[PDB]
Amino acid sequence: IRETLWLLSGVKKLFIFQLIDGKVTVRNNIIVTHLTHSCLRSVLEQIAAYGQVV
Amino acid sequence: MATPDQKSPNVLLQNLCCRILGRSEADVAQQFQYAVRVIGSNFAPTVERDEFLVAEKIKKELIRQRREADAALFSELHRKLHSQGVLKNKWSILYLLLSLSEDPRRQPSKVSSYATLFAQALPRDAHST
Amino acid sequence: ITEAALVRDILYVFQGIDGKNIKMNNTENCYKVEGKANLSRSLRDTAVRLSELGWLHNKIRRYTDQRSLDRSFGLVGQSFCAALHQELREYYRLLSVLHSQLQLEDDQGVNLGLESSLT
Amino acid sequence: IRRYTDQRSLDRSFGLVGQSFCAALHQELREYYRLLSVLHSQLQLEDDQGVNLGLESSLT
Amino acid sequence: AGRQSRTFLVDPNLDLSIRELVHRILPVAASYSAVTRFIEEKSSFEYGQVNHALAAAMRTLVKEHLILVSQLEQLHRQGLLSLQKLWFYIQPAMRTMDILASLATSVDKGECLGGSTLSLLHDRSFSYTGDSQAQELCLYLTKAASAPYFEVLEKWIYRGIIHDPYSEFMVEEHELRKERIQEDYNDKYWDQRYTIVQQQIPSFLQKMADKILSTGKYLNVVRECGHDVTCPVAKEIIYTLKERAYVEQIEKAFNYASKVLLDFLM
Amino acid sequence: LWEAALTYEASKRRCWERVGCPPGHREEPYLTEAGRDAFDKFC
Amino acid sequence: MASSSGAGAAAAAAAANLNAVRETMDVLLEISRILNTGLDMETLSICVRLCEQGINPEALSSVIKELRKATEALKAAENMTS
Amino acid sequence: MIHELLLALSGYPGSIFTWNKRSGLQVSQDFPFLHPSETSVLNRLCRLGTDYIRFTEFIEQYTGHVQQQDHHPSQQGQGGLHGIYLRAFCTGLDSVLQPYRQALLDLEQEFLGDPHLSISHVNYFLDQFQLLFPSVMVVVEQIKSQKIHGCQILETVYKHSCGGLPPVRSALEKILAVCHGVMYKQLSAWM
């Protein structure tokens, strides 16, 4: 949540979400206890799209 | 910082009387003595430690009060209580609550009839207590 | 066959779903317990008694779903389907409570032979 | 006693007073049978427990 | 086999004393099965609202019986249930179920309906005069069963309207041609609009039937006269065994209707 | 004593990484944000 | 129709995985034959599992060569002592 | 798993709940921690979740995309959702899904509160939306298929607003109220 807020706050160089060609990309080797890798990836992809726009 | 520990019946009865009457123990000495006399010789070997009977009775009472939704809520509460391992004598707690329960309909201001049925419960007396 | 498996099957039947060991016999239009030898004949009869209720539940839900979609049933038909859905919601709430109680009993890990055990 | 109770429970001709007497007898018989059941349960507990408990429940 | 009591087969290798105890106990389960059969049979709408109510009360008692059985099951799960304890605990329940089954079988043999059902209930309640527990059970059952019958009586006496889908009330309405009611010497309006169903007369209402008949006749006349009559004496009618309070209420209603009719006529 | 202890309030913070005791465990902020004493320790 | 989507997709995925494994084993066998590696289907599956677990191909090759030399020496010794 | 289930219901498909463009949201595979009857019930709820996902996809298709400035704005409404009526329709759909989102968040919070709750509790709690959503989804699909444009869309909604489901009736009343607000704004400008 904190890293997501920092991304939405416009922070660059996040650890999980990497900015590639102006596109925020999630590091592939990240997992959360309560989410599936695919579900987490989808949510983070939506968040990353908004972050890339910002 | 209070740790649960077994306190003498006198302390519990004194606190209970004080809170119920809202007066000092000196002002409830007669009532305290009467209650103490009745309580002091009362062990329940006949009570069946079965929550299911109490729950069924509560459900029937709620239905009688046209409170089926409240019966479902009570069932959920009983389920949550069972999930927690805080209480050991749940049958006793449920019996006490039901006995001290006062019908809000007695919603309304009175209850239709009191045709108590033979349904009741078990007598447990069969065991050599 | 463990009683718990029967409990699972009964919870499914309350949803109109065939259990692992209890399946709907379309020929009998009822849920049938799989012929595995370890089922007590008394337990089998009890399962049949519960499966009649599960069959009725599934039939009702099928009827409600089939008729709720028919705009040609008119407003009265839609209202009837809605009432059926409301009663089904109440039933499903009760079933959910029972299922949650069984799940809690499984979750507590203690074999409490308490009156709270799902008999 | 049980033969008498069965003989009179079937007699509709015993009338309401007779039926009431039979009912009272049945109630007393139920109390007696309850007492007998309690004693039986105590003896069964003594047999099942395997311990020579010199408790009043031991079957002497 | 047929309308026989359910029989049980016991393993021949069982203890003779155990077998005899089983044969003594099995009657309660046979009564339960018979009661369930009766409930399932008389539960059809065709059997009328009184029979439906009787079945519903039986269902409630069956639920209570099932609760008892579940408690015994719980005791068994505790290993705390002995055969003597089982017999002791079931003896009152056995007697209650046997009384209920005997009443059910008597009702079924008599095909009692409506007022005949109420009469049969009264006779059974007198038959259980000596069993306080059975008397309480029968009183509960009678009070429940009177609800539709007392509702019909109230409707007839307060509104003169027969809403009887199953023709269970002691008063039967016959369609008399009003055109000939004034023309024909026969009191088709007076005699055929409301008729007494002797078989449908409840035994507890039998003493008041004529007053009930007159009340309903008066109410029907008033409605046919075009006078809308709101009965000011309309009260809930409750079945009572010791007090004939319903009789006094019926007499009050009869007097009220008589006064209203007399004023209308004058 | 159980009733004096009953009057204890507990944190509503829960997490879906914890299910056995969801009474909170105070994430305890870090990167500056733990305050002057932590900053002094860091220095 | 609702309930079927999980198990049907799982079954289709399992069937596709089995067909893919068969295809992969066939491709590996063809590669081994062109390279004259001498691996059989069971051996190929074992090797695939080892490679998937991260074994160094140089380490794996040295280990395989030593095991093969020991196996050849043991077979030669058994034939010489008989 | 419940958090994953809500995420799928929140539009984040995972390894358990797979989204198929043709089938919509679906359970991806049999999980070893679920009874096959529990898997069947969960997929039965997943049918509603799929309908919700398809509704969200439609919402993106009709509100999330920039209106192409085709010179004739009247024809923009035909192929692509465009038009003030289209914006109002999308707004109404999002407003109707807002209560569903709120219910999903409350369910998530409740499941976080009690680890002994089962999916049956959600299925009970979400059944009202399991009945509501299919009818609105049918209505939206009909609107899309008939290419209802401008106020003619309003007339179709009115015809559909006359449905028999009281909850659907109320939802369509809200949508119709929004459409009538837009209509009244245009009427105010004209008058």
Swiss-Prot record, chain A:
Localisation: Cytoplasm, Cytoskeleton, Microtubule organizing center, Centrosome
Tissue-level expression: Widely expressed, with highest levels in heart and skeletal muscle and moderate levels in brain.
Signal peptide coordinates: none
Listed transmembrane segments: none
Family: Belongs to the TUBGCP family.
Function: Component of the gamma-tubulin ring complex (gTuRC) which mediates microtubule nucleation. The gTuRC regulates the minus-end nucleation of alpha-beta tubulin heterodimers that grow into microtubule protafilaments, a critical step in centrosome duplication and spindle formation.
Subunit structure, interactors included: Component of the gamma-tubulin ring complex (gTuRC) consisting of TUBGCP2, TUBGCP3, TUBGCP4, TUBGCP5 and TUBGCP6 and gamma-tubulin TUBG1 or TUBG2. TUBGCP2, TUBGCP3, TUBGCP4, TUBGCP5 and TUBGCP6 assemble in a 5:5:2:1:1 stoichiometry; each is associated with a gamma-tubulin, thereby arranging 14 gamma-tubulins in a helical manner. Gamma-tubulin at the first position is blocked by TUBGCP3 at the last position, allowing 13 protafilaments to grow into a microtubule.
Protein name per the record: Gamma-tubulin complex component 5
Residue numbers of the full-length protein present here: 271 to 324 of 1024
Swiss-Prot record, chain B:
Localization: Cytoplasm, Cytoskeleton, Microtubule organizing center, Centrosome
N-acetylalanine sites (modified residues): A2
Modified residue annotations for Phosphoserine: S113
Tissue: Ubiquitously expressed.
Family stated for the protein in its record: Belongs to the TUBGCP family.
Assembly description: Component of the gamma-tubulin ring complex (gTuRC) consisting of TUBGCP2, TUBGCP3, TUBGCP4, TUBGCP5 and TUBGCP6 and gamma-tubulin TUBG1 or TUBG2. TUBGCP2, TUBGCP3, TUBGCP4, TUBGCP5 and TUBGCP6 assemble in a 5:5:2:1:1 stoichiometry; each is associated with a gamma-tubulin, thereby arranging 14 gamma-tubulins in a helical manner. Gamma-tubulin at the first position is blocked by TUBGCP3 at the last position, allowing 13 protafilaments to grow into a microtubule.
Purpose of the protein: Component of the gamma-tubulin ring complex (gTuRC) which mediates microtubule nucleation. The gTuRC regulates the minus-end nucleation of alpha-beta tubulin heterodimers that grow into microtubule protafilaments, a critical step in centrosome duplication and spindle formation.
Name of the protein this chain belongs to: Gamma-tubulin complex component 3
Native source species: Homo sapiens (Human)
Region of the whole protein represented: 1 to 129 of 907
From Swiss-Prot, chain G:
Chief location: cytoplasm
Membrane-spanning segments: none
GO biological process, one term: gamma-tubulin complex localization
InterPro entries linked: MZT1 (IPR022214)
Any one annotated GO CC term: centrosome
Chain positions with N-acetylalanine modification: A2
Chain's role: Required for the recruitment and the assembly of the gamma-tubulin ring complex (gTuRC) at the centrosome. The gTuRC regulates the minus-end nucleation of alpha-beta tubulin heterodimers that grow into microtubule protafilaments, a critical step in centrosome duplication and spindle formation.
Family: Belongs to the MOZART1 family.
Subunit structure: Associates with the gamma-tubulin ring complex (gTuRC) consisting of TUBGCP2, TUBGCP3, TUBGCP4, TUBGCP5 and TUBGCP6 and gamma-tubulin TUBG1 or TUBG2; within the complex, interacts with TUBGCP3 and TUBGCP6 to form a luminal bridge with actin that stabilizes the initial structure during complex assembly. Interacts with TUBG1.
Protein name: Mitotic-spindle organizing protein 1
Swiss-Prot record, chain H:
Protein's UniProt name: Gamma-tubulin complex component 4
Residues of the full protein shown: 1 to 191 of 667
Reported disease: Microcephaly and chorioretinopathy, autosomal recessive, 3: A disorder characterized by congenital microcephaly and chorioretinal dysplasia associated with poor vision and nystagmus. Variable ocular anomalies include microphthalmia, retinal folding, retinal detachment, optic nerve hypoplasia, absence of retinal vessels, round areas of chorioretinal atrophy, and attenuated electroretinogram. Most patients have mild developmental delay and mild learning difficulties.
GO aspect biological process, one term: mitotic cell cycle
Keywords linked to the UniProt accession: Cytoplasm, Cytoskeleton, Intellectual disability, Microtubule, Primary microcephaly
Main subcellular location: cytoplasm
Tissue and organ distribution: Ubiquitously expressed.
Gene name tied to this protein: TUBGCP4
GO cellular component, one term: cytosol
Organism per entry: Homo sapiens (Human)
Subunit structure: Component of the gamma-tubulin ring complex (gTuRC) consisting of TUBGCP2, TUBGCP3, TUBGCP4, TUBGCP5 and TUBGCP6 and gamma-tubulin TUBG1 or TUBG2. TUBGCP2, TUBGCP3, TUBGCP4, TUBGCP5 and TUBGCP6 assemble in a 5:5:2:1:1 stoichiometry; each is associated with a gamma-tubulin, thereby arranging 14 gamma-tubulins in a helical manner. Gamma-tubulin at the first position is blocked by TUBGCP3 at the last position, allowing 13 protafilaments to grow into a microtubule.
Family: Belongs to the TUBGCP family.
